[PDB]
Amino acid sequence: SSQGLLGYYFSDLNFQAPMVVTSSTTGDLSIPSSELENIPSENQYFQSAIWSGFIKVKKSDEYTFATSADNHVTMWVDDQEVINKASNSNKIRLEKGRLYQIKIQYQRENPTEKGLDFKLYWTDSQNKKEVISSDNLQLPELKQKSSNSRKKRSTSAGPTVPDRDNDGIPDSLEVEGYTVDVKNKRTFLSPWISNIHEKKGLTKYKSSPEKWSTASDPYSDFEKVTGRIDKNVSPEARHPLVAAYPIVHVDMENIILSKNEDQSTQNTDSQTRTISKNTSTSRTHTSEPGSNSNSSTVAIDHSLSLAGERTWAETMGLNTADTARLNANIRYVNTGTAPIYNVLPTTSLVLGKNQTLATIKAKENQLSQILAPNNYYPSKNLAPIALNAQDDFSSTPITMNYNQFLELEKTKQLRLDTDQVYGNIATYNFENGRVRVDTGSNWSEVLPQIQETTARIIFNGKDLNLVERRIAAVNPSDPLETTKPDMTLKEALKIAFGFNEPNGNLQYQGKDITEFDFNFDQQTSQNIKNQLAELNATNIYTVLDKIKLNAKMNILIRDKRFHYDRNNIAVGADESVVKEAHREVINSSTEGLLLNIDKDIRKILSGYIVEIEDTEGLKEVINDRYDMLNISSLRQDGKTFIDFKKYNDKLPLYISNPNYKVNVYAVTKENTIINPSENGDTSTNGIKKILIFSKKGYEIG
Ligand SMILES: [Ca+2]
Ligand SMILES: [Ca+2]
């Protein structure tokens, strides 16, 4: 179906203006004029063509080859001419289960019909003639190396379409620009033509004629654009300028802490004394100069989970000589553009700066599913992985000594550092036209080259989570990399992240590019500054189509509404933004508030404080504890309810005088208190909070 001979159809007589490149499943190599909608009528006249591939016979015999235009054809089988501008009955012996190279050239001056009607036949020893069937034809070996049975180069006899990197796309098309259009059953690759293709919304591709994969990834420029590729590769990475590669971090969903048994305590029948908390995990990115790493940071919930206000040690019965253990539920997350099949990366679980508590490994070659881009392992419809699994005798306890435990209690943070060891790659095989995991292909042989030859953009426009993409970009000092097309900042955002420009303004899902800020590493910053100066431009947002990306740039693009920590996690927002986000109140009562709040805003709030203010200006704080601020919840209808009763002994607010005010304040993550004060105070005293609702009793109804 994606198999057969590869054909190049030229408008000129001498094989130099390719109009269509496409495959044929059978010996019918025709292109009817009805299929040439994307070619100018005048270029629909084909004066030459070349086909290449292999023939595999099902039975040894003597065959004679013929075409529908023998006077215009020369054909080679494994370097030997079988047709030479004349019909013949010259038989050739072909052996079953052997592969023979095929090259066919056709030339005809001034055709009177558009397209091409052309069939390749053979006749066996019994004198039966037919168009060669699909089971007998295979594509050329369009790879960087030959296989044992299939040479990557066609015979030096006759014409060679210039294809320096052997990906299948002619040099000239890669440089000048090409488009791909899907006929009913075939993909046609043709030159870009402004006045035809622009209006139709077709993508203009350019790629390096000297790089088999312009992004230095494991899929060729041709494989990508013709769909001869792992179906799990992300849509954006089907562009030859966007790198296809996995990017993995670990998400921790919840944690349970408990005291380790010890030989001195023979008693094992005591009551449960564990601490269980939800956790929130974010993939991070830091200013570390040379970084190319995977890491995530875990925030352990500090909100009320059990009676009293005990220390963790008191809760768990931990004395100073005891040790504690952690278990957790996790998933792997692939935010990259290619899947993983047989090796999950190894992860260190780290306390503080550099105290490793655990090394998390999965068994190689025993994955229960693929880890696909924009997805999880295990999938979300399945249970997560427990670090110490119930079925597993050999899971290492994740232990902390007393001092480490106290440090975890104080910081309520862990870090997960994940390596970039991703295993084998599923590649396309031209012999059988299928994608399979290839034992000879490994991500570790690809990643360094991807990292060296691309510009990196990290963007948080999807739910404020950091998503990295890499785009092929020129390196002015590496000659091979100068053969790549110019990559602009505007184009990179379109092809890598799906920005569009419906009305003269670049947008991501309705939000203008000006709603996002640009952050650069030191070298990228100097580069971009220099470019702006050379453009006489004072504002980057008006010249995104003129800013050129270079290999090894690092660009970070973040939603401007938010405040960010050093990990580039969103942790707050300006008071004006938070106030406006809460302005639309659906209902209010002594039981709480019902509001429509934007999902991104909700992400940066740790909770709310409710207070009644009397006429003299004194305030009664209702939920007056740092661990009692979790009073918001998202309803199924998408609305947020702020629950006044939850920490008011299950009672609606009592407003003794209608002139009293009910005030509700939002507390952002960056302002959240996560421990009692040094003096032991557990109240909300001093917490930096943002007034988001204030109404008198008679206004609440
Ligand atoms: Ca090529
Ligand atoms: Ca190429």
Coordinates of all heavy atoms in Angstrom, one line a residue, residues 275-277 300-312 315 409 412 606-610 621-632 643 646-648 667 671-677 680-685 687:
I275 N 1.2 8.6 57.2 CA 0.8 9.9 56.7 C 0.7 9.8 55.2 O 1.6 9.4 54.5 CB 1.9 10.9 57.0 CG1 2.1 11.0 58.5 CG2 1.5 12.3 56.4 CD1 3.1 12.0 59.0
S276 N -0.5 10.1 54.7 CA -0.8 10.0 53.3 C -1.2 11.4 52.8 O -2.1 12.1 53.4 CB -2.0 9.1 53.1 OG -1.7 7.8 53.4
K277 N -0.5 11.9 51.7 CA -0.8 13.2 51.2 C -0.9 13.1 49.6 O -0.1 12.3 49.0 CB 0.2 14.2 51.5 CG 0.4 14.5 53.0 CD -0.7 15.3 53.6 CE -0.2 15.8 55.0 NZ -1.4 16.4 55.7
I300 N 4.5 18.4 48.1 CA 3.7 17.5 48.9 C 2.6 18.4 49.6 O 3.0 19.4 50.2 CB 4.5 16.8 50.0 CG1 5.5 15.8 49.3 CG2 3.5 16.0 50.9 CD1 6.6 15.3 50.2
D301 N 1.4 18.0 49.5 CA 0.3 18.8 50.1 C 0.5 19.1 51.6 O 0.9 18.2 52.3 CB -1.1 18.1 49.8 CG -2.3 19.0 50.1 OD1 -2.1 20.2 50.3 OD2 -3.4 18.4 50.2
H302 N 0.3 20.3 52.0 CA 0.4 20.7 53.4 C -0.9 20.8 54.1 O -1.0 21.2 55.3 CB 1.1 22.0 53.5 CG 0.4 23.1 52.8 ND1 0.3 23.2 51.4 CD2 -0.5 24.1 53.2 CE1 -0.4 24.2 51.0 NE2 -0.9 24.8 52.1
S303 N -2.0 20.6 53.4 CA -3.3 20.8 54.0 C -3.7 19.7 54.9 O -3.1 18.6 54.9 CB -4.4 21.0 52.9 OG -4.7 19.8 52.2
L304 N -4.7 20.0 55.8 CA -5.2 19.1 56.8 C -5.5 17.7 56.4 O -6.3 17.5 55.4 CB -6.5 19.7 57.5 CG -6.9 19.1 58.7 CD1 -5.8 18.8 59.7 CD2 -8.0 20.0 59.4
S305 N -4.9 16.7 57.0 CA -5.2 15.3 56.7 C -5.6 14.4 57.8 O -6.1 13.3 57.6 CB -3.9 14.7 55.9 OG -2.8 14.6 56.8
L306 N -5.3 14.9 59.0 CA -5.7 14.0 60.1 C -5.8 14.9 61.4 O -5.2 16.0 61.4 CB -4.6 12.9 60.3 CG -3.3 13.3 60.9 CD1 -2.7 14.6 60.4 CD2 -3.5 13.3 62.4
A307 N -6.4 14.4 62.4 CA -6.8 15.1 63.6 C -5.6 15.6 64.4 O -4.5 15.0 64.3 CB -7.7 14.3 64.5
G308 N -5.7 16.7 65.2 CA -4.6 17.3 65.9 C -3.7 18.2 65.1 O -4.0 18.3 63.9
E309 N -2.7 18.7 65.7 CA -1.7 19.5 64.9 C -0.3 19.0 65.2 O 0.6 19.7 65.4 CB -1.8 21.0 65.4 CG -3.1 21.6 65.0 CD -3.1 23.2 65.2 OE1 -3.1 23.6 66.4 OE2 -3.0 23.9 64.2
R310 N -0.2 17.7 65.2 CA 1.0 17.0 65.5 C 2.1 17.1 64.5 O 1.8 17.3 63.3 CB 0.7 15.5 65.7 CG -0.2 15.1 66.8 CD -0.6 13.6 66.8 NE -1.4 13.3 65.6 CZ -1.9 12.1 65.4 NH1 -1.6 11.1 66.2 NH2 -2.6 11.9 64.3
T311 N 3.3 17.0 64.9 CA 4.5 16.9 64.0 C 4.4 15.6 63.3 O 3.7 14.6 63.8 CB 5.8 17.0 64.8 OG1 6.0 15.8 65.6 CG2 5.9 18.3 65.6
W312 N 5.1 15.4 62.2 CA 5.1 14.2 61.5 C 5.7 13.1 62.4 O 5.1 11.9 62.4 CB 5.9 14.3 60.2 CG 5.2 15.0 59.1 CD1 4.0 15.7 59.2 CD2 5.6 15.0 57.7 NE1 3.7 16.2 57.9 CE2 4.6 15.8 57.0 CE3 6.6 14.5 57.0 CZ2 4.7 16.0 55.7 CZ3 6.7 14.7 55.6 CH2 5.8 15.5 55.0
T315 N 3.1 12.0 64.9 CA 2.1 11.3 64.2 C 2.5 9.9 64.0 O 1.7 8.9 64.2 CB 1.7 11.9 62.9 OG1 1.2 13.2 63.1 CG2 0.6 11.1 62.1
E409 N 9.7 17.1 56.0 CA 8.5 17.7 56.7 C 8.6 19.2 56.5 O 7.6 19.9 56.2 CB 8.5 17.3 58.2 CG 7.4 18.0 58.9 CD 7.4 17.7 60.4 OE1 8.5 17.3 60.9 OE2 6.3 17.8 61.1
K412 N 8.6 19.9 52.2 CA 7.5 19.3 51.5 C 7.8 19.2 50.0 O 6.9 19.4 49.2 CB 6.2 19.9 51.9 CG 5.9 19.7 53.4 CD 4.5 20.2 53.7 CE 4.1 20.0 55.2 NZ 5.0 20.8 56.1
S606 N -3.3 28.2 46.0 CA -3.3 27.1 47.0 C -4.5 27.1 47.8 O -4.9 26.0 48.3 CB -2.1 27.2 47.9 OG -2.2 28.4 48.7
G607 N -5.3 28.1 47.8 CA -6.5 28.2 48.6 C -7.0 29.5 48.9 O -6.6 30.5 48.3
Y608 N -8.0 29.6 49.8 CA -8.7 30.8 50.1 C -8.9 31.0 51.6 O -9.0 30.0 52.3 CB -10.1 30.8 49.5 CG -10.1 30.8 47.9 CD1 -10.0 29.6 47.2 CD2 -10.2 32.0 47.2 CE1 -10.0 29.6 45.8 CE2 -10.2 32.0 45.8 CZ -10.1 30.8 45.1 OH -10.1 30.8 43.8
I609 N -8.9 32.2 52.0 CA -9.2 32.6 53.4 C -10.5 33.4 53.5 O -10.7 34.3 52.7 CB -8.0 33.4 54.0 CG1 -6.8 32.6 54.0 CG2 -8.4 34.1 55.3 CD1 -5.6 33.4 54.3
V610 N -11.4 33.0 54.4 CA -12.7 33.6 54.6 C -12.7 34.4 55.9 O -12.2 33.9 56.9 CB -13.8 32.6 54.5 CG1 -15.2 33.2 54.6 CG2 -13.7 31.7 53.3
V621 N -11.4 35.6 61.3 CA -10.9 34.7 60.2 C -11.6 33.3 60.5 O -11.4 32.7 61.6 CB -9.4 34.6 60.2 CG1 -9.0 33.6 59.1 CG2 -8.8 36.0 60.0
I622 N -12.3 32.8 59.5 CA -13.1 31.6 59.7 C -12.3 30.3 59.7 O -12.3 29.5 60.6 CB -14.3 31.6 58.7 CG1 -15.2 32.8 58.8 CG2 -15.0 30.3 58.7 CD1 -15.9 32.9 60.1
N623 N -11.5 30.2 58.6 CA -10.6 29.1 58.5 C -9.2 29.5 58.8 O -8.3 29.5 57.9 CB -10.8 28.5 57.1 CG -10.5 29.5 55.9 OD1 -10.8 30.7 56.0 ND2 -9.9 28.9 54.8
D624 N -8.9 29.8 60.0 CA -7.7 30.5 60.4 C -6.5 29.5 60.7 O -6.0 29.5 61.8 CB -8.0 31.4 61.6 CG -6.8 32.4 61.9 OD1 -6.0 32.6 61.1 OD2 -6.8 32.9 63.1
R625 N -6.2 28.7 59.8 CA -5.0 27.8 59.9 C -4.4 27.6 58.6 O -5.1 27.6 57.6 CB -5.4 26.5 60.5 CG -4.8 26.2 61.8 CD -5.5 25.1 62.5 NE -5.2 23.8 61.9 CZ -5.6 22.6 62.4 NH1 -6.2 22.6 63.6 NH2 -5.3 21.5 61.8
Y626 N -3.0 27.6 58.5 CA -2.3 27.5 57.3 C -2.7 26.3 56.5 O -2.5 26.2 55.3 CB -0.8 27.6 57.5 CG -0.2 26.3 58.0 CD1 0.5 25.4 57.1 CD2 -0.3 25.9 59.3 CE1 1.0 24.2 57.5 CE2 0.2 24.7 59.7 CZ 0.9 23.9 58.8 OH 1.5 22.7 59.2
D627 N -3.1 25.2 57.2 CA -3.5 23.9 56.6 C -5.0 23.8 56.3 O -5.4 22.7 56.0 CB -2.9 22.8 57.5 CG -3.5 22.8 58.9 OD1 -4.1 23.8 59.3 OD2 -3.3 21.8 59.6
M628 N -5.7 24.9 56.5 CA -7.1 24.9 56.3 C -7.6 25.8 55.2 O -8.7 26.3 55.2 CB -7.8 25.2 57.6 CG -7.8 24.1 58.6 SD -8.8 24.6 60.1 CE -8.9 23.0 60.9
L629 N -6.8 25.9 54.1 CA -7.1 26.9 53.1 C -7.7 26.2 51.8 O -8.2 26.9 50.9 CB -5.9 27.7 52.7 CG -5.4 28.5 54.0 CD1 -4.4 29.5 53.5 CD2 -6.5 29.0 54.9
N630 N -7.7 24.9 51.9 CA -8.2 24.1 50.7 C -9.7 24.0 50.7 O -10.3 22.9 50.9 CB -7.5 22.7 50.8 CG -7.8 22.0 52.1 OD1 -7.8 22.5 53.2 ND2 -7.9 20.6 52.0
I631 N -10.4 25.1 50.5 CA -11.8 25.1 50.5 C -12.5 25.3 49.2 O -13.7 25.4 49.1 CB -12.3 26.2 51.5 CG1 -11.8 27.6 51.1 CG2 -11.9 25.9 53.0 CD1 -12.6 28.8 51.9
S632 N -11.7 25.3 48.1 CA -12.2 25.4 46.7 C -12.3 24.1 46.1 O -11.6 23.2 46.4 CB -11.2 26.3 45.9 OG -11.6 26.3 44.6
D643 N -16.1 26.9 49.7 CA -17.0 26.3 50.7 C -16.7 26.9 52.1 O -15.7 26.7 52.7 CB -16.8 24.8 50.8 CG -17.8 24.1 51.7 OD1 -18.4 24.8 52.6 OD2 -18.0 22.9 51.6
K646 N -16.9 24.2 55.4 CA -15.9 23.1 55.5 C -15.1 23.2 56.8 O -15.0 22.3 57.6 CB -15.0 23.0 54.3 CG -14.0 21.9 54.4 CD -13.2 21.8 53.1 CE -12.2 20.7 53.2 NZ -11.6 20.5 51.8
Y647 N -14.6 24.4 57.1 CA -13.8 24.6 58.3 C -14.5 25.6 59.3 O -13.9 26.3 60.1 CB -12.4 25.1 58.0 CG -11.6 24.1 57.2 CD1 -11.1 24.4 56.0 CD2 -11.4 22.8 57.8 CE1 -10.4 23.5 55.2 CE2 -10.6 21.9 57.0 CZ -10.1 22.2 55.8 OH -9.4 21.3 55.1
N648 N -15.9 25.6 59.2 CA -16.7 26.3 60.2 C -17.6 25.3 60.9 O -18.8 25.6 61.1 CB -17.6 27.3 59.5 CG -18.1 28.4 60.4 OD1 -17.3 28.9 61.2 ND2 -19.3 28.8 60.2
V667 N -5.0 32.9 48.0 CA -3.6 32.8 48.4 C -2.9 32.0 47.3 O -3.3 30.9 46.9 CB -3.5 32.0 49.7 CG1 -2.0 31.9 50.1 CG2 -4.2 32.7 50.8
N671 N 2.9 32.5 47.8 CA 2.6 33.1 49.1 C 2.2 32.1 50.2 O 1.8 32.4 51.3 CB 1.7 34.2 49.0 CG 2.3 35.3 48.2 OD1 1.6 35.9 47.3 ND2 3.5 35.7 48.4
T672 N 2.1 30.8 49.8 CA 1.5 29.8 50.7 C 2.5 29.4 51.8 O 3.7 29.2 51.5 CB 1.2 28.6 49.8 OG1 0.1 28.9 48.9 CG2 0.7 27.4 50.7
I673 N 2.0 29.4 53.0 CA 2.7 28.9 54.2 C 2.5 27.4 54.3 O 1.4 26.9 54.2 CB 2.2 29.6 55.5 CG1 2.6 31.1 55.5 CG2 2.8 28.9 56.7 CD1 4.1 31.2 55.1
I674 N 3.7 26.7 54.4 CA 3.6 25.2 54.4 C 4.0 24.6 55.7 O 4.0 23.4 55.8 CB 4.3 24.6 53.2 CG1 5.8 25.0 53.3 CG2 3.7 25.0 51.8 CD1 6.7 24.0 52.5
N675 N 4.3 25.4 56.7 CA 4.7 24.9 58.0 C 4.2 25.9 59.1 O 4.0 27.1 58.8 CB 6.3 24.9 58.2 CG 6.9 23.8 57.4 OD1 6.7 22.7 57.6 ND2 7.7 24.2 56.4
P676 N 4.1 25.5 60.3 CA 3.9 26.4 61.4 C 5.1 27.4 61.4 O 6.2 27.1 61.0 CB 3.9 25.6 62.7 CG 3.5 24.2 62.2 CD 4.1 24.1 60.8
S677 N 4.9 28.6 62.0 CA 5.9 29.6 62.1 C 7.0 29.1 63.1 O 6.8 28.2 63.9 CB 5.4 30.9 62.6 OG 4.8 30.8 63.9
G680 N 5.8 28.6 66.4 CA 4.7 27.6 66.6 C 3.4 28.0 66.1 O 2.4 27.2 66.1
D681 N 3.2 29.2 65.7 CA 1.9 29.7 65.2 C 1.5 29.0 63.9 O 2.2 29.0 62.9 CB 2.1 31.3 64.9 CG 0.7 31.9 64.7 OD1 -0.3 31.2 64.7 OD2 0.7 33.2 64.4
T682 N 0.3 28.4 64.0 CA -0.3 27.7 62.8 C -1.4 28.6 62.2 O -2.0 28.1 61.2 CB -0.9 26.3 63.2 OG1 -1.9 26.5 64.2 CG2 0.2 25.4 63.8
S683 N -1.6 29.8 62.6 CA -2.7 30.6 62.1 C -2.3 31.2 60.7 O -1.2 30.9 60.2 CB -3.1 31.7 63.0 OG -2.1 32.7 63.0
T684 N -3.2 32.0 60.1 CA -3.0 32.6 58.9 C -2.4 34.0 59.0 O -2.2 34.8 58.1 CB -4.3 32.8 58.0 OG1 -5.2 33.6 58.7 CG2 -4.9 31.4 57.7
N685 N -2.0 34.3 60.3 CA -1.5 35.7 60.5 C -0.2 35.9 59.7 O 0.7 35.2 59.6 CB -1.1 35.8 62.0 CG -0.7 37.2 62.4 OD1 -1.6 38.0 62.9 ND2 0.5 37.6 62.2
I687 N 0.0 36.0 56.4 CA -0.1 35.4 55.0 C -0.4 36.5 54.0 O -1.4 37.3 54.2 CB -1.0 34.2 54.9 CG1 -0.6 33.1 55.8 CG2 -1.1 33.8 53.4 CD1 -1.5 31.9 55.6

